Protein: Putative L-asparaginase II protein
Amino acid sequence: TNPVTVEVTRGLLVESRHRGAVAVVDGDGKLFFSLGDIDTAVFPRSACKAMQALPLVESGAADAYGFGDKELALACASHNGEEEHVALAASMLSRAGRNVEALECGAHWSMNQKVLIQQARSLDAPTALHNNCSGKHAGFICACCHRDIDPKGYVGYEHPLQVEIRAVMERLTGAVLGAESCGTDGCSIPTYAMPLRNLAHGFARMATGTGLEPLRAKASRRLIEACMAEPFYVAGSGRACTKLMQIAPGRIFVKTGAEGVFCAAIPEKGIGISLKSEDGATRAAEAMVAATLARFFETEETVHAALMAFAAMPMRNWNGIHVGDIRATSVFS
Amino acid sequence: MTNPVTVEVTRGLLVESRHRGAVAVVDGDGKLFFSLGDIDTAVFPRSACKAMQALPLVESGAADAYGFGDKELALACASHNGEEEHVALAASMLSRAGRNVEALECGAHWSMNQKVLIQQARSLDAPTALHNNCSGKHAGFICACCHRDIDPKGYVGYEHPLQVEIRAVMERLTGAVLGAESCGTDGCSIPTYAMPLRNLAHGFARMATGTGLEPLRAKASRRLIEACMAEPFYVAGSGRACTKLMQIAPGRIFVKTGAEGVFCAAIPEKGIGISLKSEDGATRAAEAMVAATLARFFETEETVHAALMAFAAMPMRNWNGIHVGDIRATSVFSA
Ligand SMILES: [Cl-]
Ligand SMILES: [Cl-]
Ligand SMILES: [Cl-]
Ligand SMILES: [Cl-]
Ligand SMILES: [Cl-]
Ligand SMILES: [Zn+2]
Ligand SMILES: [Zn+2]
Structure:
C-alpha cells in the first residue's frame, strides 16, 4: 500500500500527490533501500531498453556495422525524434542494407513540445524513424541481419529475436517472463511485468557483472558506458534522462519508462535502482529517481545540489510567475 | 481518510497504473447523492469553476451592453484550444470593451490540443495572449470592468474590485471561506481558492437549479450554463473531452475540466452538481471519472449511457493501432 513519494504544491497547500515504490539493490541482490510494494509485477516499458539491446552487442552486430557510443545509446533510447536521432537510425538500418520500411514500430510526433514545433514546421507527418523507439528497433533489425535472420515480424512473441530477448531478461533479473506477465508495448513489441526488486537486480548485475558470464558482463558494460557517454542519444533536448547523466559524467546511468518507471545504476557503488509512480506520472518518476540518486551523493555537494534541482522542481505559470513546486517527500531522507 | 482507486490503466492481463480520487454529487439543497473519497479537504478548482467566475460579466450587465450571445458566454467559461474561432472571438469581446490583446494579463502559450498546436506552429512564429486557454475568461473580466467604468489594469490582483467581487460571489455560491490561506496563483496569474469538493459541487447545483440564489444570480447562472451546453466548441474545442461530453445529450449535460485532474459538472434537469479530483492530477483519470459519474444518472438512456461509458472505459491503441489495454473507471462508480 504505496507511500506518497511526490507532492505538487500551489500557494500554502499540496494540490496533487503521487504514490510510488522504489527498489535499490547491489550486484549480489542485497536490498539497500525500498519504498512501497517492490514485489508486484510492474511493466518496465522503455526503462529496460538497455537489456533489450544486449542481442545487438552479444551477436557481434554492433562491431560488424561499426556501431560506437552514439549508435548503442540510440539502441537504448526513447528519443525526441530530433533530426540527429532520425539520421543516426537511418544510418544503422542503411549499414545493414535496410531502410525505414523495415521498421514495424509505426510513426508519431515528438513527445517534447519544443521538438514537436520543429517537426511540425519541417515535416508533413512523422516517419517510423521519428518513433521514440526507432533506435531500439534499428538495433533489432541490425541484430537479425548480421545473423542472417529475416527481420520480418521481429516484433512477434515467437520471432527468434523476442525469444532471445526473453531468455536474456530472465537471466539478468531472475524473473519468469511468459504469457501471464506479457503485454504489447507502445511500439508493438512484448513488455514483461516483473517485480521492481528483480528489475533493480537486473540493472545492478549489468552495472557490476556479478552473476553474469563474461560476454554478457562485457556487453552490459559497453551499453551502460555508451548511454553515459552519449546521453543526448538516449533522449535529447530538454529531457530528464539526458540532463541527469550530464551532472556527473560517466558516473550515473538513468532511463525513463512509459507510465512513470525509472531505472538507474551507479556502477562505482555497485547498485541498481528501479521505481514506479503508481499513477504513471513522468513528473513523479523524475523527482523520485533524482531523490533516490541524491541519497548516494550526500558527500558530493555539487552533484547532490544538481540532483535536488530535479527532486524539488519549481513550477512557473505562462507569465513566468512561480506558483509552486513538484517535490519528493521526506521518505527519501 | 485514504482515497479509493477510481481509475485503472491496464496492459495485457494486468493493471499497469492506478489513480485515486474523490467525487461529490450534491443537489440544490446540499443533499449528497453520491461520493467517493475525501470531499471535505480543500482542493484547487483551477479552470473547473470558470462559469462561477463569469457571473460578474453577466450580473454587471456587461454581457448585454456588449451584445454577447451564447458563444461569448461559452468562451468566457472556456479553457479553449486557441483555435482561429476562439482567438477571433476573444479579440471581439475585448474590442467591444474598447480594448485589445495588450489588456490581457494572462500571457501566451501553445494549444492544449496537439493537432491545433501543429496548425499554430505552421502558421505562427509564437502564440499571443489571445491563444491562452483563458483568454475568453480574461476578455470577460476586462468587459465586466470596462462596462462599470472600473480600470481593468491589474484586474488579476487580489484586492482589485473584480477579484473582491469573485470572492464574494464564490463564497455565496459555495458556502466555502475563500481567503489568503486558501489562495494560490493560477496558470493565468489570477487567484485560485482551494475549497472542499462538496462545497464546489453544491455551488454548481445552485447555479444549475437556482436553489438558494437571488433572482439575478439565478438568472445569470442559468444563462452561463445554458450558453456552455448551447456552444460547447467554445468551452474547449476540436478533440476536447468537454465539447464531446456536452454533444452527447445536447442542452442536458454541463461539464468543465480543471488543470490537475479536476472536473465540475451539472445535470440541471436532475437538480445535481458534480465535482471531482484525481488525487495525482491526471487529466485522463478525471475524464474517466466525470464520464462514469454522469453515466450513473443516465443508465436507462442507453444511447447516452453508452456514449458516456465510451469515456469511462476506453481502449488504448499504440502507434500501429493495436488495442494494448484500457483506461477504466473502477466499479465503485456502479456501487
Ligand atoms: Cl518519448
Ligand atoms: Cl549470463
Ligand atoms: Cl565525472
Ligand atoms: Cl487585439
Ligand atoms: Cl445569491
Ligand atoms: Zn519501445
Ligand atoms: Zn485561468
Q: What stands out?
A: The CA atoms of residues 215 and 324 of chain B lie 52 Å apart. The first strand of chain B starts at residue 5 and ends at 11. DSSP finds 14 helices and twelve strands in chain B.
